């Protein structure tokens, strides 16, 4: 009887009520009760979306790569990769600026020497690039590996179209049947995404409630200042980077935000961009009128290697650690931070646990090593205390950047349905 | 020269001859030879049947969920879950009764104090229920996890039907092509099931022979009384619970048993219900006239969370252990046993080794802890010595209960083909 | 920009140039540079080929087993298995002959006792044969298990054909749709194989260069004789065994080598028969005109259980070790070597790491045990020092034998397209 209420209002109600409920439950210490009785519903929501992530990616990208020329696909790839790199660098820049504004970690007052102990190397860029090419596509499917599925789906769709243009009719009909199987699978997946969005408000409520209950009490003092800095920086990344980039390429930013709100809230509460990918793709298709041959390629790739929010978070935490141990970063050191954050977002393409590897890389780049028992590790552990509070906002901005780049590239390729943007 | 012989006679001959052969070979101690030369054929049979389980489940259920309304699907689910819980409770009750009748373990005479230190714990019910929803369906397919595949296949079939009732023709044609792929796969699977049933007598013979050769000598003394008890209870669970439930809803029980015979014997010799699933569904379709939209959903669900024979076995062994260590169970304790056995069938939905987790849970419910070196662990090992002899019958009764509940629900939903139930 | 150059000549140029480049770089000690900068390209080639192996096998075999009668399928299986066993025995015989000819290991002069302790075990024939039948075909697909996928695809194709000959129309149309899906998948796979053969020269160059640079310096002294022996034997296995078997059944051997050159060079540089399988199947179809219902079954089966080159290598290395420790093999011992080499080719059907298992098995068959610190283990390590130089030729001859047997069985079943064999 509740399905009749509109979904977007229900999701916003769940968000607001879960935030307030979690704060109130953590203020009275019932956070364990929230983890035991309320959290499983949000976990169910996240499982329902993660269920859809792999089939929708495989099928939608086979279809899209079929419904597009290889030259256009490569041009779109170059465009979207340039967008991703530029926006990530801008996110690190905004993170450093907002950190210097908030003066994060200035009152932690830890003593640190000039000692330096050599650590291990980051995972090889070459091996990750080779790992883009799978050695068993069924295996990469079972393992949830996005980038190799992207590669295989693109190759499969291109082969299918080249087969549909043959003289023999049996070959054409076989390729047509195969493409129909993928299209029916994709349609079913998007249908199910729409179905799951009906339960989405409950999961939104439960997830925001659990996070607020477990980490609301920790947002005081310097960690509170960190939270304020990170969220301000994210806000700027949307309102300056994304809005100016959308106006430069002629897209109404407010309509963009209104359409993306669903993927935004899903990413904010699930804190997993790849797990928001189904809602993100459904917003790209059935809200913004982006063609499948664009978003079916850019959105998984973007969920994997485009995290503006993570880059801004890294800029803030590196300023925090440097100011907390008492060695503020020189200008050239912050330039190294930006360069290393972008190159490390690239180099960490699809590995698990990439957040901490990237953060360790950025810290090591300026000579802040995570030796155990050292003040640097201490400040890093301080930051990790509010990691979920930060993860919400950073994942939201990651998905929002994915969508903005998708829309910009689609507008530049005239693959954007303008009829969705006129009132 | 082989295929021309009738199949039912061949499987029955293989069962009986393998039982006698295994008994005779194990009584004279050549059981190792049976393990080396005879068992691999039964192993081949089990592998051939296990091979089909995942494709046939996925395809049959996508097809069935497509060819049915979501409201009817929900009604069937509620019906079959009520049937399953009621029959499991009835099985624990029958196990307790037959155990009290045979006075199992009364002459083991072990000394036991009243000390108990907690060892096991239940796997969280919430996490088990959440694990039903997969997070990667390709992975769940690869790992053989039935319940998440069931969930994904139902969601996919419903989406396919909702797409076929759309206005655009391209969407209809894509959804129909997909449903045809799944239907062709399922048809191929059932074809292969029929083909493998030709080799079934050899594997049946080998399996019953190996089990009889390895565990025939052990059916003496108190364990003998256990076997005689357990099988009796299993028999009663078939003859009273199933037959009365079938006559209540207007199903001739003898026709039901005659049709289920193939799945019954397969479950009895392979001792894995999910591994019997292909024969069970092929019997449900091509023998009992159950609609795919019913059995394609109930039979795997029943193989996973409906084990009447295992519940009756638990009822028997709890009385056995309590009588062996010298502490017979109170009436209220037996009621708690029934309640916890039913709740534990749910709580172990799809976990590996669920038999022992459920048994440990039921024992702990009445305060019998399996600390090593204690007399309770000793009696439990006594019981585990004949686990295969018991596993045959209990798995058979698990599969038979699945089939009976499926036919009952199909009769109540007018989804049952009456033309298959008329004799000439 | 170089794509316009013909492909086969480019593959030959890459082979020769990589051999020379690797030799030159390894003699001057720059092998690390080759491993760091050159090898990743050959690795990319090998991963690209490995990607296709599972889909092409599954789909091509479903199609072929569908498009053939079960009686003919069984006849073809018997024929190709007899061919495989005969050629493996012949290869062991040639290996023993060329080893005794080159007097391999005669000048190592190691002292050896008479101790014999068993190392690894053979997997029980019963358990391996049972393992041929999968218990989850999705699992075998994900794990790359070739033999169970072969079994499942054959059973599925036979079921599909039996369904297409039914009276109900829904059954016919469903099975027909499924077979269309598998046919489209296989067609797409062969298309992509052809596409990857465009990058094949780069990978050929890189692989041969890396191998020659890392193990070129080691081909001196007694090991040099081993190389001289092994390749000689390999050469003989091609020019006597295969040529006589092709001439007996009326196939011009030179045309066969000309058509097979692609799979030959791919096997030689990638050293993986299953990884050459796509090129091998494409050569069987679009060069030799072998029907899918033949090669789609014999070629994966041959890559798995037909290794003439490996058998010849075993024949050479057992004589090498026996002469190195000072106990040359009696006539009955060499007969035991041949028998056990064939029986071990059968018994290790599909196990991982079978290369070392088979060699340890044959050595144990003649009483040469790999106890650590023993001289037998020492000679085995000597051979493993040049195992890669040997592996190139070994895989090449394994794949060539696969193709030769496929063409012979196809000629005997009148499933061979003669129009490709006219000058
Ligand atoms: C584990 C148990 C979880 C319980 C969750 C309950 C599932 C929700 C019940 C179904 O609700 C409907 O599902 C449709 C699915 O199609 C949605 O249509 C959506 O999808 C279609 C897109 O083609 C369009 O009808 C609409 O744009 C779009 O609202 C529609 O909103 C919604 O009312
Ligand atoms: C390790 C090697 C294993 C070899 C397995 C042995 C194969 C035996 C030869 C074929 O035997 C027939 O195979 C058919 C299927 O292939 C079956 O059709 C059956 O299956 C159909 C299912 O659609 C039914 O409709 C038919 O009525 C029914 O005859 C049939 O019963 C069976 O006699
Ligand atoms: C830095 C270098 C990187 C290079 C990567 C770029 C890949 C471009 C591939 C171009 O090569 C063509 O690919 C076609 C397949 O895509 C082949 O068609 C072939 O494939 C069909 C198979 O269906 C056959 O029937 C046809 O006869 C046959 O022309 C064709 O032979 C081949 O020339
Ligand atoms: C402890 O929680 C975990 C832990 C591990 C995983 N698996 N893989 C993975 C890999 C990388 C990330 C970084 O991405 C963003 C961020 O964290 O900065 C944010 N989450 C986003 O999705 O955009 C995130 C996850 C998932 C959740
Ligand atoms: C000993 O071999 C095995 C093989 C697999 C496992 N893991 N999963 C599992 C889960 C539940 C059961 C209970 O089901 C019956 C029983 O045993 O009571 C009987 N098997 C049947 O299929 O109906 C049995 C197994 C454990 C042991
Ligand atoms: C690097 O390549 C490989 C390839 C496969 C694996 N896995 N298991 C396996 C399987 C087979 C072999 C036989 O080996 C042949 C030889 O050497 O005579 C030659 N390599 C060949 O493929 O025909 C050896 C091993 C590991 C590495
Ligand atoms: Na970016
Ligand atoms: Na993620
Ligand atoms: Na992202
Ligand atoms: Na029950
Ligand atoms: Na089971
Ligand atoms: Na059952
Ligand atoms: Na051979
Ligand atoms: Na390999
Ligand atoms: Na081979």
To test the pocket of ligand 2, the residue of B46, B195, B420 to mutate (highest count of ligand atoms within 8 Å of its CB) is B195
Q: Identify which of B53, B72, B275 has the alpha carbon closest to the alpha carbon of residue B186.
A: B53
Q: To which H or E segment does residue B160 belong?
A: helix B146-164
- Within 8 A by CB and 6+ apart from B142, the residues are A138, A142, C136, C138, C139, C141, C142
Cα gap A31→A8, rounded to integer Å? 27
Collect all residues from B whose CB is shorter than 8 A from any CB in C. 40, 43-44, 47-48, 50-51, 53-55, 138, 141-144, 177, 180-181, 183-185, 187-189, 191-192, 195
Nearest-CA residue for ligand 5 atom 24 is B355
Using a 6 Å CB cutoff, which residues line ligand 6?
A: C 271-273, 307, 310, 313, 352-355, 391, 394-395, 398
Is C253's C-beta closer than 6 angstroms to any atom of ligand 3? no
User: Three-class SS string for chain C?
Assistant: CCCCCCHHHHHHHHHHHHHHHHHHHHHCCCHHHHHHHHHHHHHHHHHHHHHHHHHHHHHHHHHHHHCCCHHHHHHHHHHHHHHHHHHHHHHHHHHHHHHHHHCCCCCCCCCCCCCCCCCCCCCCHHHHHHHHCCCCHHHHHHHCCHHHHHHHHHHHHHHHHHHHCCCCHHHHHHHHHHHHHHHHHHHHHHHHHHHHHHHHHHHHHHHHHHHHHHHCCCCCCHHHHHHHHHHHHHHHHHHHHHHHHHHHCCCCHHHHHHHHHHHHHHHHHHCCHHHHHHHHHHHHHHCCCECHHHHHHHHHHHHHHCCHHHHHHHHHHHHHHHHHHCCCCCHHHHHHHHHHHHHHHHHCCCCCCHHHHHHHHHHHHCCCCCCCCCHHHHHHHHHHCCHHHHHHHHHHHHHHHHHHHHHHHHHHCCCECHHHHCC
CB C64 within 8 A of CB C294: yes
Q: At what angle do helices B308-325 and B70-102 cross, to 10 degrees?
A: 30
Ligand 1, atom nearest to A48 Cα: 1
- Across the interface, which of B137, B174, B181 has its CB nearest the CB of A187? B174
Residue contacts between B and C (CB atoms, under 8 Å)? 74
Which residue matches tokens 């296989």? C186
Is A130's CB within 8 Å of C181's CB?
no
CB A405 within 8 A of CB A309: no
Cα gap A369→A201, rounded to integer Å? 42
User: Count of alpha carbons within 13 Å of C257, Cβ hemisphere only?
Assistant: 12
Q: Give the distance from residue C185's alpha carbon to the nearest chain A alpha carbon, in angstroms.
A: 7
Residues listed for chain C: 423
Dig out the tokens for B244 from the structure.
């009365």
Q: Give the distance from residue C36's alpha carbon to the nearest chain A alpha carbon, in angstroms.
A: 10
Q: Which of B44, B50, B184 is the mutation pick for testing C, counting most C CBs within 10 A?
A: B184
Nearest-CA residue for ligand 5 atom 13 is B355
CB A138 within 8 A of CB C141: yes
Tell me how far CA of residue A290 lies from CA of A183, A411, A421, C243, in angstroms: 17, 9, 11, 60
Helix residue ranges, H only, A1-124: 7-27, 31-33, 39-66, 70-102
Collect all residues from C whose CB is shorter than 8 A from any CB in A. 40, 43-44, 47-48, 50-51, 53-55, 138, 141-144, 177, 180-181, 183-185, 187-189, 191-192, 195
Is A55's CB within 8 Å of B133's CB?
no
Cα dihedral across residues C35, C39, C43, C46: positive or negative: negative
CB B393 within 8 A of CB B226: no
Q: To which H or E segment does residue B60 belong?
A: helix B39-66
Question: Ligand 3 mean position to C192 CA, how many Å?
Answer: 7
- Within 8 A by CB and 6+ apart from A388, the residues are A211, A214, A215, A271
Is B198's C-beta closer than 6 angstroms to any atom of ligand 2? yes
Judging contacts by C-beta atoms under 8 Å, the chain C residues touching residue A156 are 188, 192
CB C190 within 8 A of CB C282: yes
Dig out the tokens for A360 from the structure.
């360790």
Largest CA distance in chain C: 76
Cα gap B70→C351, rounded to integer Å? 47
Residue B43: closest C-alpha in chain C:
C130
Cα dihedral across residues B153, B159, B165, B171: positive or negative: negative
Dig out the tokens for B9 from the structure.
């006679």
Is C286's C-beta closer than 6 angstroms to any atom of ligand 3? yes
Cα gap B416→B256, rounded to integer Å? 13
- Across the interface, which of A136, A162, A177 has its CB nearest the CB of C181? A177
Q: Identify which of A50, A97, A77 has the alpha carbon closest to the alpha carbon of residue A311.
A: A97
Residue B28 burial by CB count (10 A; 0-12/13-18/19+): exposed, middle or buried? exposed
Which residue matches tokens 């409950």? A202
Helix, strand, coil share of chain A (percent; to 5): 80, 0, 20
Q: Give the distance from residue C133's alpha carbon to the nearest chain B alpha carbon, in angstroms.
A: 7
Cα gap B339→A77, rounded to integer Å? 60
Over its C-alpha atoms, chain B yields an Rg (Å, rounded) of 22
Question: Ligand 5 mean position to C182 CA, how many Å?
Answer: 35
Measured from the Cβ of residue C247, the count of other Cβ atoms closer than 10 Å reads 11
CB A237 within 8 A of CB A388: no
Cα gap A59→B107, rounded to integer Å? 65
Cited resolution, angstroms: 3.0
Judging contacts by C-beta atoms under 8 Å, the chain C residues touching residue A155 are 192
Q: Give the distance from residue B400's alpha carbon to the nearest chain C alpha carbon, in angstroms.
A: 23
- Within 8 A by CB and 6+ apart from A349, the residues are A128, A129, A132, A147, A304, A305
Tell me how far CA of residue A98 lies from CA of A103, A198, A236, A315, B234, in angstroms: 8, 37, 9, 9, 73
Chains in touch with B (≥3 Cβ pairs < 8 A): A, C
Nearest-CA residue for ligand 2 atom 31 is B194
Tell me how far CA of residue B6 lies from CA of B2, B42, B399, in angstroms: 9, 20, 24
Cα gap C261→C184, rounded to integer Å? 27
CB C132 within 8 A of CB C149: no
Q: Which of B152, B187, B276, B285 is the mutation pick for testing C, counting most C CBs within 10 A?
A: B187
CB B386 within 8 A of CB B231: no
Ligand 5, atom nearest to B310 Cα: 18
Judging contacts by C-beta atoms under 8 Å, the chain A residues touching residue B161 are none
Cα gap C275→C46, rounded to integer Å? 7
Question: Ligand 1 mean position to A388 CA, how many Å?
Answer: 30
Q: Identify which of C206, C266, C258 has the alpha carbon closest to the alpha carbon of residue C53.
A: C266
Q: Identify which of C265, C230, C214 has the alpha carbon closest to the alpha carbon of residue C21.
A: C214
Cα dihedral across residues C87, C93, C96, C102: positive or negative: negative
Is A171's CB within 8 Å of C187's CB?
yes
Nearest-CA residue for ligand 2 atom 21 is B191
To test the pocket of ligand 5, the residue of B271, B353, B393, B400 to mutate (highest count of ligand atoms within 8 Å of its CB) is B353
Is A162's CB within 8 Å of C51's CB?
no
CB B326 within 8 A of CB B112: yes
Q: At what angle do helices C308-325 and C70-102 cross, to 10 degrees?
A: 30
Is B175's CB within 8 Å of A188's CB?
yes
Residue B281 burial by CB count (10 A; 0-12/13-18/19+): exposed, middle or buried? buried
Is A170's CB within 8 Å of C183's CB?
yes
Residue C416, phi then psi, degrees to nearest 5: -115, 130
Residue C38: closest C-alpha in chain A:
A126
Dig out the tokens for C356 from the structure.
């070392």
Q: To which H or E segment does residue B260 belong?
A: helix B253-270
Dig out the tokens for A256 from the structure.
């963009």
Residue B187 burial by CB count (10 A; 0-12/13-18/19+): exposed, middle or buried? buried
Dig out the tokens for C57 from the structure.
């096998």
Q: To which H or E segment does residue B332 belong?
A: helix B331-347
Helix residue ranges, H only, A216-242: 222-236
Options 1.10.3860.10, 1.10.10.10, 2.60.40.420, 3.30.750.210; CATH for A7-420 is 1.10.3860.10
Residue A290, phi then psi, degrees to nearest 5: -85, 140
Residue A142: closest C-alpha in chain B:
B139
Residue B2 burial by CB count (10 A; 0-12/13-18/19+): exposed, middle or buried? exposed
Experimental approach taken: X-ray
Largest CA distance in chain B: 76
Is A175's CB within 8 Å of C192's CB?
no
Residue A172: closest C-alpha in chain C:
C184
DSSP string of A256-286, one letter each residue: HHHHHHHHHHHHHHH--HHHHHHHHHHHHHH
Question: Ligand 10 mean position to B187 CA, how many Å?
Answer: 29
Residue B137: closest C-alpha in chain A:
A51
DSSP string of A369-381, one letter each residue: ---TTSHHHHHHH
User: Count of alpha carbons within 13 Å of B8, Cβ hemisphere only?
Assistant: 7
Cα gap B177→B163, rounded to integer Å? 12
């Amino acid at each position: 009887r509740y399905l009749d209420y509109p979904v977007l209002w229900k999701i916003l109600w769940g968000l607001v009520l879960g935030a307030v409920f979690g704060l109130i439950a953590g203020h009275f210490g019932y956070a364990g009760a929230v983890k035991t009785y309320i959290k499983p519903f949000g976990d169910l929501f996240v499982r329902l979306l993660k269920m859809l992530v792999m089939p929708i990616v495989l099928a939608s990208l086979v279809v899209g790569a079929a419904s597009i020329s290889p030259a256009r696909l490569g041009r779109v790839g170059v465009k979207i990769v340039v967008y991703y790199l530029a926006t990530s660098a801008m996110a690190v820049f905004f993170g450093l600026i907002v950190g210097r504004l908030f003066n994060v970690g200035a009152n932690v007052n830890l003593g640190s020497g000039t000692g330096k102990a050599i650590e291990a190397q980051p995972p090889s860029l070459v091996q990750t690039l080779l790992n883009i090419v799978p050695t068993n596509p069924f295996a990469s499917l079972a393992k949830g590996e996005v980038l190799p599925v992207i590669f295989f789906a693109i190759i499969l769709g291109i082969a299918i179209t080249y087969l549909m243009n043959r003289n023999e009719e049996r070959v054409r009909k076989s390729a047509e049947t195969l493409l129909r199987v993928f299209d029916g699978l994709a349609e079913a997946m998007y249908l199910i995404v729409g179905g799951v969005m009906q339960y989405a408000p409950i999961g939104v409520f439960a997830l925001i409630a659990y996070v607020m209950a477990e980490q609301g009490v920790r947002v005081v003092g310097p960690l509170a200042k960190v939270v304020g800095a990170v969220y301000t920086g994210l806000f700027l990344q949307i309102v300056i980077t994304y809005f100016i980039l959308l106006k430069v390429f002629g897209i109404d930013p407010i309509k963009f935000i209104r359409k993306a709100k669903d993927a935004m809230i899903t990413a904010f509460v699930t804190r997993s961009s790849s797990g928001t990918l189904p809602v993100t793709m459904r917003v790209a298709e059935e809200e913004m009128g982006v063609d499948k041959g664009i978003f079916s390629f850019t959105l998984p790739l973007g969920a994997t290697i485009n995290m503006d929010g993570t880059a801004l978070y890294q800029g803030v935490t590196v300023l925090f650690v440097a100011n907390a141990i008492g060695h503020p970063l020189t200008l050239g050191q912050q330039l190294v931070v930006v360069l290393t954050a972008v190159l490390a977002s690239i180099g960490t393409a699809g590995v698990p646990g990439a957040g901490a590897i990237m953060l360790a890389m950025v810290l090591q780049s300026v000579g802040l090593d995570l030796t155990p028992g050292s003040p640097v590790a201490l400040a890093y552990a301080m930051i990790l205390g509010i990691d979920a509070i930060l993860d919400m906002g950073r994942t939201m901005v990651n998905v929002t950047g994915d969508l903005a780049g998708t829309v910009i590239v689609a507008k530049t390729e005239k693959e954007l349905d303008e009829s969705k943007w006129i009132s």
